[PDB]
Amino acid sequence: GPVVEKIAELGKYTVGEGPHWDHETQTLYFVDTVEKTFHKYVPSQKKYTFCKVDKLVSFIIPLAGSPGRFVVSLEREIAILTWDGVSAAPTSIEAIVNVEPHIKNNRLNDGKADPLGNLWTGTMAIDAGLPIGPVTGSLYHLGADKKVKMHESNIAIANGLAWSNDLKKMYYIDSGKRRVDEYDYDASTLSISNQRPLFTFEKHEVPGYPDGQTIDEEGNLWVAVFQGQRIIKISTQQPEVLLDTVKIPDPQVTSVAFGGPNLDELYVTSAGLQLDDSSFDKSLVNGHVYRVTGLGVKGFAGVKVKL
Numbered sequence: 001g002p003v004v005e006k007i008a009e010l011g012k013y014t015v016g017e018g019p020h021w022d023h024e025t026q027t028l029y030f031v032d033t034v035e036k037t038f039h040k041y042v043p044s045q046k047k048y049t050f051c052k053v054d055k056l057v058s059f060i061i062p063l064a065g066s067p068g069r070f071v072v073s074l075e076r077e078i079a080i081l082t083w084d085g086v087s088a089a090p091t092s093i094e095a096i097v098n099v100e101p102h103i104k105n106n107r108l109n110d111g112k113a114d115p116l117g118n119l120w121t122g123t124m125a126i127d128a129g130l131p132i133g134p135v136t137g138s139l140y141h142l143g144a145d146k147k148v149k150m151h152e153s154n155i156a157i158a159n160g161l162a163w164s165n166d167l168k169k170m171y172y173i174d175s176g177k178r179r180v181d182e183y184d185y186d187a188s189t190l191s192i193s194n195q196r197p198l199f200t201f202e203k204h205e206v207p208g209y210p211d212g213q214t215i216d217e218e219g220n221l222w223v224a225v226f227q228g229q230r231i232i233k234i235s236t237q238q239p240e241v242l243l244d245t246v247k248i249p250d251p252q253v254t255s256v257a258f259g260g261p262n263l264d265e266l267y268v269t270s271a272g273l274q275l276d277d278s279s280f281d282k283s284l285v286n287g288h289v290y291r292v293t294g295l296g297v298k299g300f301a302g303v304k305v306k307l
């Protein structure tokens, strides 16, 4: 079976999240969604750094064409952070847009560029809760002239995103729905339609909640299962097909990104935050970062945001 390695050099995260693999610099970036910190890992040189801000963060993606600059979330603002990748604070911050200026208790959560470089991201209540809590989020993309467009409402916990290789489908996760949805994606108008369930956890006895996801070159989705102690591999060719399960030692698996020189090493983030209604005792909940090899598939390099 696949090899699952705990990355000792990286330590433990409260809620490690938002992994992004920059293929040209062979570097993994990620966030902690509770501790207000950004993180950088260079595996070939065993180099780790972090950056502190005073707002809640949920994604970090290199800005296309601008070395040393990243598109990030700061609470409800999408911003450009100028960061040298090693100092413990940003050099400067350039706000782009506040997606929800008048919803004081919301935050941005998962975000990712589509294959064309358009940032997609969604919101949630800061005090969202599972299985039931306030449902206040929406799904957006950042379009022309730095204005966002809304694509879906009634989202409890805005989470993982992926697009098919032929640009005809988008896949999206609201963790509260305990399923992965598929949509027809119109690359020319950047709109989505015909929402329907692709994979429903209760139909396959999968515990926990879908969180982050990524897609491989064959079109399979790799889905992080929060409170499931696993990643799952699901089909996009047929609905409701579980292809494989890989157990991860940490119960609170949060997200996934393919990396390594050949894009065939799956980086997996997790959360050490101990929750009062957990299916797992506190001794099990650590928050390590893992690397999975031997899956027999390749992914894609992380896409930079175009502004």
Ligand SMILES: [Hg+2]
Binding pocket: 038, 051, 052, 081, 083, 089, 090
């Ligand atoms: Hg930073």
Ligand SMILES: [Hg+2]
Binding pocket: 038, 051, 060, 070, 072, 081, 083, 090
């Ligand atoms: Hg940053």
Ligand SMILES: [Mg+2]
Binding pocket: 017, 110, 158, 159, 160, 211, 212, 254, 255
């Ligand atoms: Mg997430």
